[PDB]
Amino acid sequence: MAGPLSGLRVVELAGIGPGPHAAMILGDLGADVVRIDRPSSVDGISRDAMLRNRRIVTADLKSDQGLELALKLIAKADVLIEGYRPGVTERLGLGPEECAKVNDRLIYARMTGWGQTGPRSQQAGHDINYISLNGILHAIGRGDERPVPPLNLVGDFGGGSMFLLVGILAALWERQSSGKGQVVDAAMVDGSSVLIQMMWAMRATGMWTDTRGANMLDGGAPYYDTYECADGRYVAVGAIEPQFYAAMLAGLGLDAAELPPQNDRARWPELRALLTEAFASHDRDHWGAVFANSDACVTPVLAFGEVHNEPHIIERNTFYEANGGWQPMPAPRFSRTASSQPRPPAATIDIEAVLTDWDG
Amino acid sequence: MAGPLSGLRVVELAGIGPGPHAAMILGDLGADVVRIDRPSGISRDAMLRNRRIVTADLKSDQGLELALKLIAKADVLIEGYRPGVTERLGLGPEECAKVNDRLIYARMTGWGQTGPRSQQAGHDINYISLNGILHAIGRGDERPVPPLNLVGDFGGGSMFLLVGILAALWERQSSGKGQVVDAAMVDGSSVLIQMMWAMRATGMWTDTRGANMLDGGAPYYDTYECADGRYVAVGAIEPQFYAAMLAGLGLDAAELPPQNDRARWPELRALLTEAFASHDRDHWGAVFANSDACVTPVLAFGEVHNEPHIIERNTFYEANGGWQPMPAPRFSRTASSQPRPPAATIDIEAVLTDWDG
Ligand SMILES: CC(C)C(=O)SCCNC(=O)CCNC(=O)[C@H](O)C(C)(C)COP(=O)(O)OP(=O)(O)OC[C@H]1O[C@@H](n2cnc3c(N)ncnc32)[C@H](O)[C@@H]1OP(=O)(O)O
Ligand SMILES: CC(C)C(=O)SCCNC(=O)CCNC(=O)[C@H](O)C(C)(C)COP(=O)(O)OP(=O)(O)OC[C@H]1O[C@@H](n2cnc3c(N)ncnc32)[C@H](O)[C@@H]1OP(=O)(O)O
């Protein structure tokens, strides 16, 4: 199996959202990932490309046999991922303490939103709930409208799965010294809060306010925002640094002498009006050409369906084709132990065949 | 130094955005992080917590030499400059492999190491514009809105650099060697959004903005304005949670269009808008506490310190000006400690003494 995590063995108790995303990335980087779903599901080969780089197996964990075949896999594995409410694995007899008895090297990875304890620990939730409580959601969107969810990118993935991954891999490093596993408690409310640590730092130094749409990076700055073009499509401007901003202005055909200063926030309404009228005078692909090799920080805002035509995307093979659509190649990239193209989802496998393959 | 990464040594060449963030998290989890800045008081950027800062003109002979001495003693090097920059300093991968064949050489860029955009300046908003992400964010009648810099720099940036550094350290235990980790934000952010690429393939996600289950188009996955002008979030995807939300709103499910009849979503949204608008945020927070309705108050940063669930799990600690997030995630046996504030600049020889030779 190709990639830096070759030899790593992973047992994933099937869930939704961050847990399968984390499991995917371990698989992506070479890990041997075994996913235990309930038979209630099954039903053929999965259409969900997030379940790539997996072996799938069936098991009623509520039964005695299920529980024991599962504990057999866990006994022979480096990592367990579960993303159920707190107490589910305990009551099932797959809790940490029970796993510690059959394998004290195990990294026991717990993926939740609210965490393992506290008042909200038993409430159902999704990404939007977790980022609502820690100030993130309130900061996203235009000032003149209600907050808009940044899909499920910030709580589920950036502040969820990715912190689970770091925990798993950090614990594997620790196990090199200690000879012992441990429990990783990844909560989306905490992970997403560390993801936005910059804003908490700037807030303390007065460089970020709680007013939505009135900061440097939330759309409030005319030089960090999107602009509608003549064709109704968009470009993105990110020209924070003065030397990039000056390059953007020159490409737009605006003389700096006729504009207010870049960072005179009292005159941001005028500046936005000027930039708005300028960008609106030609179509997106015009601006794309004008700025193509520049430091002006102006890029076309592409829709998913257009991404496969962008030369830079094509040439670095960011994407690969699979089953009526592109999918992202693994990230990040490794010079010596490169990842391979992901294996598509396969048919289920018997849990015994796996215990056998894993030496048994 | 507390945490699972005790005894990991990290040299960080100072930059902006994702590199400092990755360094921070390594520090948070107990790595020994030395940050080389350029000689041009104590830094009040709390993202520079859990560091030792040294200055060195990396363009001088003595600065280069001192730096290669650090790197020789270290496990990981982080750099976030345009491609070519470290090479010309004499700090490229191959120069470093001469003094330390075990080094994890971690390169954090937006566009990657090669290709037509590899020398273009850029920020978060640019990297997410090219791969479909930015286009998908915001309301349908408006131009796309940047989700701060959370998706390109941090989620699809620093976090993938971390996954790469830590996976490479695992590979190192079996091979005895380091390697180069190439983390591009355009790549990481695309994997971060793999769920949308999956759903587009199964015909369950559209390129139309504001028209999808998770982009704000769904009336049961969106924010709602309350009687006081503050907001709740609703995330009631599962029918059983959705039903519970409707009951607590006082709405009879028989009077409403089906949850997932998308042609009638505008109608359903109008009905939920009127209901949520009739009480204030805190009323709804109370009504739905301990429920699976997936309704939560949308707090602004300055309110977060007063929320019971936040306080009791110590998600934050107080620093100088105000609150900062504690390290994440959390570990049973080797627990992170509270971050050390940004220290005063120390001399680079001191560090070398500390590190043996
Ligand atoms: C991708 C989109 C949708 C997002 O934005 S996702 C973020 C979703 N939230 C989370 O994952 C946070 C943590 N998880 C949760 O809060 C909850 O799993 C959830 C998502 C709210 C779903 O709640 P529920 O459906 O009440 O499930 P849970 O409380 O986790 O319990 C799982 C049940 O499955 C049972 N289970 C799980 N696997 C098995 C197998 N293989 N066999 C038998 N029983 C099983 C388990 O025993 C539980 O049954 P009960 O005994 O009846 O309680
Ligand atoms: C604003 C935030 C919040 C975001 O949204 S951040 C995401 C920003 N983008 C990135 O970091 C992607 C990768 N980095 C870059 O593209 C570029 O660094 C940048 C951000 C566009 C800035 O470009 P520049 O200021 O031209 O810097 P670089 O090209 O990286 O080169 C840095 C120079 O500093 C020099 N340098 C660096 N450290 C030192 C020290 N210690 N001593 C002396 N000289 C030094 C280095 O040798 C380079 O010199 P030259 O190539 O000979 O000019």
From Swiss-Prot, chain B:
Keywords: Isomerase, Lipid metabolism
Function: Catalyzes the epimerization of (2R)- and (2S)-methylacyl-coenzyme A (CoA) thioesters. Accepts as substrates a wide range of alpha-methylacyl-CoAs, including (2R)-2-methylmyristoyl-CoA and (2S)-2-methylmyristoyl-CoA, (2R)-pristanoyl-CoA and (2S)-pristanoyl-CoA, and the cholesterol esters (25R)-3-oxo-cholest-4-en-26-oyl-CoA and (25S)-3-oxo-cholest-4-en-26-oyl-CoA. Can also catalyze the interconversion of the non-physiologic substrates (2R)-ibuprofenoyl-CoA and (2S)-ibuprofenoyl-CoA, which are potential competitive inhibitors of the enzyme.
Pfam families xrefs: CoA_transf_3
Impact reported for residue 153 to A: 17.6 of wild-type activity
Impact reported for residue 238 to A: 2.1% of wild-type activity
Keyword presence, Iron-sulfur: no
Record lineage: Bacteria, Bacillati, Actinomycetota, Actinomycetes, Mycobacteriales
Family the UniProt entry places it in: Belongs to the CoA-transferase III family.
Active site, renumbered: 123, 153
Use of this protein: Development of gem-disubstituted substrate-product analogs as inhibitors of racemases and epimerases is elaborated using alpha-methylacyl-CoA racemase from Mycobacterium tuberculosis as a model enzyme. These non-physiologic substrates could be used as a therapeutic agent to inhibit human AMACR, which is overexpressed in prostate cancer.
Outcome of mutating residue 123 to A: 4.5% of wild-type activity
Gene designation: mcr
Protein name in the entry: Alpha-methylacyl-CoA racemase
